[PDB]
Every structure is written in C-alpha cells, then in structure tokens.
Amino acid sequence: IDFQTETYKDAYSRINAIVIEGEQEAHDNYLTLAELLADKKAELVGLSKMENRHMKGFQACGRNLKVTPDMAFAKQFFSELHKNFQTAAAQGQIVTCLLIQSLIIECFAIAAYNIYIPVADDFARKITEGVVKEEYSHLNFGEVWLQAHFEESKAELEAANRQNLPIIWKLLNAVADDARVLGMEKDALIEDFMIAYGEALGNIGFNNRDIMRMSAQ
C-alpha cells in the first residue's frame, strides 16, 4: 500500500476523522455514564481517560501522514448514534447507554482496528495495537455490568438492539469504500463486528437463539 497517494490521503482524511470523533464521543459517553452510574464512577472515569489517550494517538496518526481530518464528515457520520445515546441518557436509560457505547461501539472499534492493524503504516500500527489492547476492558466493563443485571435489563437490551443495531450496519456500509482504499475488506469488517457483538451478547446471558434473533435487526 502506498500511504502518500492522493487517493489514500483523501480516504484517510475521512477515516481518521471518524476514529477521532468516535474516540471523543466515547470519552464523553463514559463521563455521562459516570453520572448515571454513581456506583461505578471511578471505573467509568478511568475508561474516559483511556479514550482521551486514543484520541491523541489517532490525531498523531493523521499528522504522521500529513492528512487533515475531515471533522465535519465525522460529526455527520456519528450524529444518529450520538442522538440516540443522548436521548437515552436524558431519560436515565443506563442499559441503553451501555449497549450503545460499551457493547456496540466498542465491538465496531475492535472489529475495525484489528482489520486496520495489518495494513497500517508502522507508526499507526503501533498506536492502534495499544488502543485495541485497551478497548477489550471497555467491552468487558459493559459485559460484566449487564451480566450482573441481566434479567432486569433484558427487555431494554432487546429494544436498544432493535433501535441501534441498524444504525451501526449503515455506518459499516457507509465507511466500506474508504476502508477498502486503506486495504480493509468490508466483508471482514461485517463478519468481525457480528462475531464480537454476538459473543458479547452471549456473555451477558442471551441464549444462541436470542443472539441470532438480535443479530437479525
């Protein structure tokens, strides 16, 4: 892969902006969760601080390839997930907030970052490797909490999945062209998100039929 073509820098302007905006949103979402879940404030504040470090690392990736991120593009990209998290937070829907951030968004990131790693430039590869090592703890936080509250959370989890999983599939379809320019196959991204997200639903307490039913939305 040639990291200095106009085609690569163009695609990267949007992808790098998307990760940066995603990291900033995760930082904000974990702080919002620290107010809704007072009991886990220290944990959630620590997760927010990892997200700041991720955001800084991906800013540095962009400057390494001399690419100015298209931050407007990114903000548009996340607007529906952002709006949904906020509407949930505004009503005290902790379970919906956890499903959007800790499960769906972290699964999306884990899938994507692991596909990027073997096609990234050396500097971005090292950064991304450290980020993805941390994103497993984010996912596990949500899995542990929702597992411990499963029966009481189950209905809300199903409704939040119906509402937000279709949003993530649009994002996945929308990024695919630029992701291909970077060397990332779309089918691998779809498959890896569905594996990661199904396994997360399994850990929280959904049976295999329910996972298949939910994966269908």
Ligand X SMILES: CCCCCCCCCCCCCCCCCC(=O)O
DSSP run (H or E) holding 45? helix 41-64
Interface pick for Fe ion out of 77, 138, 157, 206 (rule CB under 5 A): 138
Closer residue to ligand X (CB): 15 or 94: 15
Q: Which does 16 bind (CB under 5 to 8 A by kind): ligand X, Fe ion, none?
A: ligand X
Name 108's Cβ contacts closer than 8 Å, sequence gap at least 6: 168, 171, 172, 193
Query: Is 27 near Fe ion (CB under 5 A)?
Result: no
Burial letters 98-111, b for 16+ CB under 10 A, else e: bbbbbbbbbbbbbb
Smallest separation (angstroms) from Fe ion to the CB of 106: 5
Smallest separation (angstroms) from Fe ion to the CB of 7: 27
Q: Which of 8, 7, 6 is nearest to 119 (CA)?
A: 8
Q: Which does 112 bind (CB under 5 to 8 A by kind): ligand X, Fe ion, none?
A: ligand X
| Interface ranges with ligand X (CB under 6 A) | 15-16, 18-19, 22-23, 26, 51, 58, 61, 105-106, 108-109, 112-113, 116, 124, 128, 135, 138, 175, 179
Q: Which does 116 bind (CB under 5 to 8 A by kind): Fe ion, ligand X, none?
A: ligand X
DSSP structure class, residue 217: -
Task: Give the footprint of Fe ion on residues 29-58 (CB under 5 A).
Answer: 51, 54
Closer residue to ligand X (CB): 36 or 117: 117
Q: How far apart are CA 139 and CA 99, in angstroms?
A: 10
The dihedral formed by the CA atoms of 40, 83, 161 and 35, expressed in degrees to the nearest 10: 10
Task: Give the footprint of Fe ion on residues 53-72 (CB under 5 A).
Answer: 54
